[PDB]
């Protein structure tokens, strides 16, 4: 009654509503719609509205004032202009004089034009009026993200190890690699629990496999790591190996499981494992079929996944290939200087995730045969949900965890999200700030971004700082590209502020968890934009390099280079906490208004919100060893806080077991 | 105050400083030299030390965290990771509880690793040790700067039109062209003094020509221009076309002034014209030859030009092209896909600016023959050079408005700089920022960056923004690539709010030209970061979003978008100004300390010191109109300014008829 769904044409079903709502009949209650050019929906803003949502998308949590295009593309530069990422989160609030929210409910290209054409318009299109639009109307923004949150189904939630420290690196291939990850964390007592298995562990990049010289005793090796608290987080990726022999790959054949040509020709897309097929995610018996192969490595004691290249990215297809090869030729004995350098050069660069062949393959829905581009931002949430649906057949009562990178509204009920190949810059610490609140809104709570920076070469401080907000993000994991410096925190000196920075990690668990736990089970958000708390406050509205977390704190990263501090703004009084490098938390009272406040490398920063506190566990190098039944109480006297706690491995959630009220 | 020279090996002579210093025989002062693998300067920082230096080079005004490159390179994409921009400027200070100054005088490939490998270490690198160092010592960094500006003599001073907005895209071709862009300005009454040209104004991009169908009576449309005070600014590249009959390439080659081969041929590289020579820039009769050239222009009644692609810039060579051709070959015929697509793709991008092709030709410098990767940083340099030189030859009492892309430190002396390709990020408004005072210390106070981004597409409020910081660069201009979003002030709705901030500009011409001029004739700075003024601060040195100008203000220019405001530390009492929309000036005294303000994306802001006061004069749509008779004078009541004011067209710098004291 506070939300309804104005349907155009015939839109295919994507399934991201959990709730069934009817269609509406009056009028587009805003702006303007047009089918003239396909479908536009065109909204003059007041010159104070502010934009929210967009999930995963570039630039700030104001979205006004640039162009975003869902579209998910592997793209692993993520500058100021790039107007498309791996996600593709429809939903959007416009908060001001007047108030509303908008999904679209497309599958294909659409595009976000926020005040970058006309700075008061905001306008809405696509190539086919084939949708279904969702208007939630409410108080405000924060009111209207929850009534979405409510029709889209409960988040997903990861097992309790997942909130520990992981570290990745593409490059590990061997035993002796991983040994000595377990060694340099375990050896100097930094608090770890996961360790991630990037492309190489497997045979020749064959999905489901693992590589037979180097692990020919996987099943031992897993334990070998998992007694230590270590457990093993293995990557599958979207291309089946065309390979004779190969089970998975003669199965996709034999039964018509891969995306095929329009003549019923198994489609080419060439990625790590050179040829591959894509398995048609968005056939129920194909996703079926590949999700049950998840099996292979959780009989092995494997108990959490992460999926890439789920666009799905194409290196190029067979088309592209002899395309390129012609083209090269061509240049090759070119006399005249008729075929410049740039153009041999736009060509190879055009073979790769290109339009065209998104254009050259086919899902098959039920016998019907629809061209993948027409539902191309599906394939990621399918090829995730083909995998949470085979965790709920092996293994009902046991949670997993399980992230991917491509997404669509509706995947955050089967998995997280990571923010993919960001780089080792200082933008893309406050790039990840900004994703978190958006990506709340959109049901994706268990998220984070690669610490460090994926991409190019860190420094010592710039993952320090990295790893201080990630130290507040479900998903904390260093992971970095190959041929990287490389940057687990034992690479550099004075290790032990790496210690420090993870400690206030572990000793925060409990708080965090149950923050998330909370969140997830009532439908609610776990970071917020300071104007979803303080929505009468017109300068807190619009703060961006701050997040409410919880009920409980604020968090502030320094994301400046050699900064030694930052500026804040307080909405209201609040604690000034630090976690000290001694182990040590400093408290400071500070009250509403700007402040400047100091913050050392090796300190991690946060705020307790007036007559609000929070449960701090001692430092423990391991999820596990943590102890909740005495941890103290930071903040305002006589305070009190409702601590969340369960097994952190089963499905149990109602139980008034699970609530203990703390009191300061 | 001391300054030392410290010789290794047998140094190349770049003429940088001016001013005669004995070689030192006495141990080196600071660190360590070792010469056992090239050379290395390897010192051991306090943890409190900021270094200061590198002119223009990437990152911020503290340079600690990371390693930079003197190694002037052609890249368009200036992203946090490059280790190389177009600058090579080898002067650093360390600051803190041990101050000095090091100019590393050294015309190669020289890395700066400032506490990139491990944080407290600072070491600079080359592959020989044939430099000279000079030491520079003082109470602080500002005063060793002082110094070393001394030695290395005045800088360029351009003449007083350039102290207008100027309006420029890669794309004006044809008269309408520009007529479109003069009528779009001078009809919506916004100030302009210059229209530049870029290549598309000559005859199929050759040096010193103008394509006579385009422009049948060139020197009438230059004074069609010029009657409405608008002064057309003529691009001039390096590569000289090869083309039979066309006389600067026939005698270029016929008195051997071009770049040679290992074997006496002309060297071929490619740039917009396809085949070009690049003249021989640091030989002497090459450079007055090709400096001459000018003349052509000059007599048509142009005032001023600017270089580029003088690194110099080399889509390819010969030898590359042959090479990718052959490549291309073998991808063509590849049936085993032995020879993937990023294999050709690389091979593409390695012929652009290879570090091959710069061990292909030679300089012949006074009879020896010096290949030119061993002097590769000074190419540019010695273009700029020929230029200002033959200006004097010319016309010694008048000033010509001359800037260039690449550079060393010397040709400070002979012209400005722009920071290149830039983009249009937000983040660019604070590289652009950062970078003056750095530019500064090293000679480089006529400087500027792309206004509104060069690549990429911008958007209203990022330009209104970019355009507030432009106010205060001595090079004000509007400049874009092809294929961008047209940029031109007019291209916007609400085209006032353009007018405002451009008005501002000229209000402030006599202050900005004032301090400029003082500045240049006493070898001082123009903008100077706050630790400058304010040494004893511990929290103003750490400053990198301000800068001081002049001893009277302090600039702040908001840099985040959707931000109505921003947060300013002032280290001392100062009056916050506002250039309002409706041509009225805001002001309100503030204490020392951390604020907040608001500055609308109309309004220009900057901050009064403390017992100061400045000139401000109407708003005038020239140079030449505005009324510095009278002017208001705007800060503290009783404070006095020194305004400097010549014709600023001839170099009559001396006269004390040039100072005149004004009183609030
Ligand atoms: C110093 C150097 O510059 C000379 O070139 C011009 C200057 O750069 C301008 O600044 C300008 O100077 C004027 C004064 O500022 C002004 O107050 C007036 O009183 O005198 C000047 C007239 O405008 O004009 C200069 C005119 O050329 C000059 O070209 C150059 O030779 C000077 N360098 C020295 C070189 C020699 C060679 O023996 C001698 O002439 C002197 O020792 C130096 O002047
Ligand atoms: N790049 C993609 C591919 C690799 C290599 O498997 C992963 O390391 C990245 O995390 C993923 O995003
Ligand atoms: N890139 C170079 C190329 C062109 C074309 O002249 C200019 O527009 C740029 O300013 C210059 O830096
Ligand atoms: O061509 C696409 C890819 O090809 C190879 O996988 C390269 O290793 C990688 O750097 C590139 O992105």
């Not at 009084?573 to 400071?588: A, C, H, R, V, Y």
Request: charged residues 30%.
């Amino acid at each position: 009654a506070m939300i309804r769904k104005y349907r155009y044409g015939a839109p295919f079903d994507t399934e991201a509503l959990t709730e069934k709502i009817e269609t509406a009949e009056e009028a587009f209650p805003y702006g303007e719609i047009s089918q003239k050019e396909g479908f536009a929906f065109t909204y003059i803003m007041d010159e104070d509205d502010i934009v929210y949502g967009l999930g995963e998308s570039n630039r700030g949590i104001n979205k006004r004032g640039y162009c975003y295009i869902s579209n998910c593309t592997d793209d692993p530069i993520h500058t100021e202009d790039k107007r498309s990422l791996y996600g593709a989160h429809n939903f959007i609030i416009v908060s001001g004089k007047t108030t509303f929210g908008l999904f679209f409910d497309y599958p294909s290209k659409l595009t976000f034009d926020i005040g970058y054409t006309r700075m008061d318009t905001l306008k809405v299109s696509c190539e086919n009026a084939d949708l279904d639009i969702y208007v939630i109307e409410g108080e405000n923004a924060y009111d209207i993200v929850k009534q979405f949150r409510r029709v889209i189904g409960r988040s997903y939630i990861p097992p309790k190890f997942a909130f520990g420290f992981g570290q990745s690196r593409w490059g590990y291939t061997t035993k002796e690699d991983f040994r000595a990850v377990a060694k340099g964390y375990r050896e100097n007592h930094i608090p770890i629990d996961m360790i991630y298995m990037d492309i190489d562990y497997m045979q020749d990049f064959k999905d489901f496999t693992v590589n037979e010289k180097n692990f020919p005793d996987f099943p031992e090796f897993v334990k070998e790591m998992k007694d230590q608290e270590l457990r093993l987080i293995p990557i599958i990726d979207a291309g089946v190996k065309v390979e004779k022999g190969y089970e998975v790959y003669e199965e996709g054949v034999k039964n018509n499981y891969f995306c095929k040509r329009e003549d019923g020709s198994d489609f080419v897309a060439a990625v790590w494992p050179g040829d591959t097929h894509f398995p048609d995610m968005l056939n129920p018996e194909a996703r079926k079929w590949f999700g049950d192969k998840y099996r292979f490595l959780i009989d092995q004691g494997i108990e959490g996944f992460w999926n890439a290249m789920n666009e799905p990215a194409i290196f190029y297809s067979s088309e592209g290939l002899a395309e390129a090869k012609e083209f090269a030729g061509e240049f090759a004995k070119d006399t005249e200087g008729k075929i410049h350098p740039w153009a041999m050069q736009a060509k190879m660069k055009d073979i790769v995730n290109s339009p065209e062949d998104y254009k050259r393959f086919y899902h098959n829905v039920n016998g019907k045969k629809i061209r993948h581009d027409k539902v191309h931002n599906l394939f990621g949430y399918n090829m995730t949900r083909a995998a949470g649906e085979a965790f709920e057949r092996i293994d009902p009562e046991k949670r997993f965890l399980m992230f991917s990178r491509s997404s669509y509204i509706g995947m955050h009920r089967y998995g997280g999200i990571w923010m993919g190949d960001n780089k080792s810059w200082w933008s893309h610490i406050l790039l990840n700030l900004k994703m978190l609140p958006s990506l709340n809104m959109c049901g994706f709570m268990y998220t984070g971004a690669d610490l460090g920076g994926f991409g190019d070469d860190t420094t010592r401080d710039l993952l320090l700082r990295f790893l201080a907000l990630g130290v507040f993000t479900p998903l904390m994991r260093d992971h970095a590209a190959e041929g990287t410096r490389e940057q687990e925190c034992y690479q550099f000196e004075n290790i032990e502020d790496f210690r420090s920075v993870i400690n206030a990690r572990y000793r925060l668990v409990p708080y965090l968890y149950s923050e998330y736990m909370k969140a997830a089970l009532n439908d609610d958000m776990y970071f917020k934009p300071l104007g979803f708390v303080y929505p009468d406050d017109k300068m807190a509205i619009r703060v961006e390099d701050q997040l409410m977390l919880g009920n409980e704190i604020m968090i502030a990263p320094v994301y400046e280079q050699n900064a030694r501090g930052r500026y804040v703004y307080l909405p209201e009084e609040m604690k000034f906490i630090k976690f000290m490098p001694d182990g040590s938390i400093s408290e400071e009272v500070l009250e509403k208004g700007v402040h400047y406040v100091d913050v050392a490398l090796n300190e991690v920063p946060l705020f307790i919100r007036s007559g609000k506190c929070i449960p701090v566990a001692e430092a423990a190098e391991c999820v596990k060893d943590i102890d909740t039944e005495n941890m103290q109480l930071i903040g305002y006297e006589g305070s009190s806080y409702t601590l969340y706690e369960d097994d952190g491995i089963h499905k149990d959630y109602d139980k008034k077991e699970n609530y203990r009220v703390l009191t300061k």
